[PDB]
Ligand binder design. Sequence first.
Ligand code: SF4
Ligand code: SF4
Lengths: 623, 624
Amino acid sequence: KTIRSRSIWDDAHAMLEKAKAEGISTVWDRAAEQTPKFGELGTCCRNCIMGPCRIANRKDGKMRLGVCGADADVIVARNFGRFIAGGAAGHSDHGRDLIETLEAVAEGKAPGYTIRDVAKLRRIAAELGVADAATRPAHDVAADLVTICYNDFGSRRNALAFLARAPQVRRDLWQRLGMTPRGVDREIAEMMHRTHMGCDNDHTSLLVHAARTALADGWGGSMIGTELSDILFGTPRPRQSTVNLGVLRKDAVNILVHGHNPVVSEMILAATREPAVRQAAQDAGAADINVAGLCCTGNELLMRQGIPMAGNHLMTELAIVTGAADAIVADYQCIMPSLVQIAACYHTRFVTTSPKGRFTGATHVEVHPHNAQERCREIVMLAIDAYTRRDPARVDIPSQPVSIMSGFSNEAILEALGGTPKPLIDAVVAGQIRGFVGIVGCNNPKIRQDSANVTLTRELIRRDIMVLATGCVTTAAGKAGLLVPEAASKAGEGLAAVCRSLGVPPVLHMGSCVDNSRILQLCALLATTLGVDISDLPVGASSPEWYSEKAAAIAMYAVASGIPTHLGLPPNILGSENVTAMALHGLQDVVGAAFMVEPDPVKAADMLEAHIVARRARLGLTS
Amino acid sequence: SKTIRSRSIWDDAHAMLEKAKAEGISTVWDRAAEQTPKFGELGTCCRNCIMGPCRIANRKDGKMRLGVCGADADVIVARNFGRFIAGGAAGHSDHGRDLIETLEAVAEGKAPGYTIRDVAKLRRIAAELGVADAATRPAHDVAADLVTICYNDFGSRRNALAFLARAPQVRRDLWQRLGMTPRGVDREIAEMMHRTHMGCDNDHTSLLVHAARTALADGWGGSMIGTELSDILFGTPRPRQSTVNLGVLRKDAVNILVHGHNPVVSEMILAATREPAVRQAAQDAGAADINVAGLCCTGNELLMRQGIPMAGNHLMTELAIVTGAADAIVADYQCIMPSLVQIAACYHTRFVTTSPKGRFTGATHVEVHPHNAQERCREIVMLAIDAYTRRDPARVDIPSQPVSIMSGFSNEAILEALGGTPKPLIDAVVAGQIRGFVGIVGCNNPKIRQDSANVTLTRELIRRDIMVLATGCVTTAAGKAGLLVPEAASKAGEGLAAVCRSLGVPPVLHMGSCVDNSRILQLCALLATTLGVDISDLPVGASSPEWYSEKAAAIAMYAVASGIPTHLGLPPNILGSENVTAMALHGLQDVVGAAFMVEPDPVKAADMLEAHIVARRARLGLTS
Ligand code: SF4
Ligand code: SF4
């Protein structure tokens, strides 16, 4: 009965029983061992060896301050600052890689890569100030855009380049508060400086720079990553695909791409479509080479190529347990190192491709733009060889894939509306669509897998609130059949009408974790057109099953941009009443939004709907 | 009280610990007594995501051997230590970046009261880094071009940091093969925070290699830019006399204590106290003078360039307020204990913060920037004079009499003492008069009796003809024991005493603040370049007997990664992993040519540093 309580899906239940009988420990098993304190409240501090310090509520009054004299407010806010910095650094390095990949294309030093979307390149470059971006040669225009993006990774700017997309009132508010992101790397470095012993000892000051650090992610690292990926590999358009472990085929070579970087996974797919490589699969007894995605790199291949997704966070271990995973191609971020051990229990080849994502015991085939075509060809060959060593008795692909619709970039959304946001604004004014909520969460073993994600998605569309899905929720919403146009039947009367009018699902898949920058861009476009602030728009954000530092950075820059953000579990901040009050209430007075911590998905829909209604009133609209 | 005598070796510290106990004031030793009790000290506690936190323990049932994500002790300890190093590099990185912004303000003409005090060093540094016509163009044009170069080291488009060219070719080629070449000061910090995220870098060798790269971006980037631009803006240090300990505070004067690391504020504070209208405000209040005294590294900075006396080091900062004569504390950022704000409220003292980065709840914030510093610092000295009129004379007790010291031993001053070349210094090392050099760069740590290890190790090394280069907190330790004066050659060995008397210098050279440990890198790289060898071939060493901060770990790491055997008094939070520990103590020797040494006995630490110096003298074909 424990296996039934760990997830809500049959394919996950099937593989949990399979690993149990085979003696394979999963992420849920190791979570039970680690359940048993001071670090979870954020009141443990390890920032120097004057002593590991813990702040307790003791009867005798001892241990109330650290050795240096820091109180619980400073200690909690510093750990939280480093937590956001690590989340921002995640997206930061990703955007920088995309800058390097575009610079290699511009220099002509990336065989097999091209500028797939030249029209978006000219638009983005013109938006950011590149002279004659409309008419100059594409590679020259790309080089000037590369310089611009790199300069946001420098230390000589007053505001990040894409920050111009925000409404003027939002930018003036950032100026007054001192939150204006100046440089992508610089805010990260200043956060690490402030959290050092004896530097920043004011929890209000620390949280304001956390907002500044997280804003440098959403409007810098992530937005550069999203826009440059569309330039290099194509801007997403609506298309059909499938989800869950059933996307693996018994008769094919199954290559699972895992991580966040489309630079590697896009070239993997190109190699599996080469004629000589497809021949090697048939020679090994396979009908084809089947590429399926995992986590954010899967979301990227889903949006731009329609490649089916095997599963989200907690499904990554179970996909190897199917016995049909012939290789796992990893880059970096959110790749559990337990996959290496579970792959050793089978024939699966675990291949790492990035100098930043090294895993002891893995097969490292380092991929760079100048050798990607050759290296990825070599990586696909290792998957065909591993296929010949597959043990057929241990194969169990549990379910049948579920149809989904993906590729809802802002470009695709506006094209569906006829090239303007006016029909969308009209529906919101009419009350057909009462608001929007972006669900951006992960999975967390503390919560039954996707129970909160699917319930909250169902609750919101019932109340005529459209849902924008990124990250892990894509698999959650898709498995429940909410990512298809026919799912309008499960929405309210107004939302179903608008969805059927446009032929779109009530849940729009807008991409990976960095593609939450698409939600910032969309909100900024609506606020600009209406002449109001983002904090005036009937919008919301939710992370019901989050776990990572990157999720908290996403939650933080949504709040600081005026988007009320709900979290299923609290961050490690409850040890300080002041820091907790600031996150839940005080931030509303400053940036116009705040955090919400609610483990009940229905109560969370009530809170998100309440803020949406209050903002409809301030626009002079009926709920 | 026998407990008070066990916490320091200095009478001016004992005298204030009695005073603090008499008045019910709790110090840093009292709070350290409460925080003695575990996994974080071994480094096996991970809080990088709310899928835990996770503790790696050893239980007979085999449970809790991996994190929820599956990470083992090696990865967890390495990521904690990696983030520990990144925090230290970030402290120096932001300090260096501010020095760039000040120089740009001078170049733009938007910093009233600031100048280019050392134009000759500006042209020299700019020419070294590739500025065209640095010798002849207008100074502000040259400064603007040097600012661009430094800023680009804080960008993401370079393959190697600008000052890395000072390193020997064999050292740079070695960094290239290992993948340690520092590319950008902020970038390595950001990549470290990326690598330590869940599910990114899960190989402890990979993590420590980038820890070395991150720390090298401090020593050859953030700190070196900070040191060299500070000399350009506020002057290159020259040898001079001064005093240390709490006796530098005067009962008859307005006592202003500068605290932190940034000379940009303290230099302008000092200029404000010499304005006639400000000196009048003090005289109108009944004071004989305005007395500025330094604390921590900013005190080291004012000591090197102005000769301003130092009140004390890390653990003395609380006691200086207890004297009752501290009329104001002017703070910028870093290593400023927030308990000072509360202790100042026990007296008349004004606690003033000046930086947007160093904010303290309950403090008086008068934010200083280059464009308003002359006006703002004038306002800050006035607050010190006003607080002086409210001083309680019954609570004043300045315990000891100041000790004479000699300071200001920049590499420029050292080469000038040698006739403009390192040849006499090389000759003494070849002759065996100076058997080696060791930089003692430590802090204070309440776990260790204050300066007991620093002073013992300093005495032990100079006795064995090993010259000691002192930075940071050790400056106060060496000075109080009377080792920072030329007459202290009598306490050195026969060979070292002879060389010291020939040059008229102490056997312990004070080379500046914590960021000025980049001066030691510059000196080592200069000797290795002259000799045609690697830094790992020089009879050199580094020691931090009483360290505590992330900055000390970053300094120790870029010393090791540069080939300098580094001794630590206390171990970093890494003992939870045998592999990470073996790599730090032994494995790194095979990779970068040096390793960490953890030894709490100062005499045994002198034995270890002397052994490596002897081994390297042998490989140079010299008499050991
Ligand atoms: S920074 Fe302060 S609270 Fe944190 S470990 Fe060091 S002494 Fe303790
Ligand atoms: S990163 Fe891994 S070891 Fe660290 S807290 Fe998260 S699950 Fe636990």
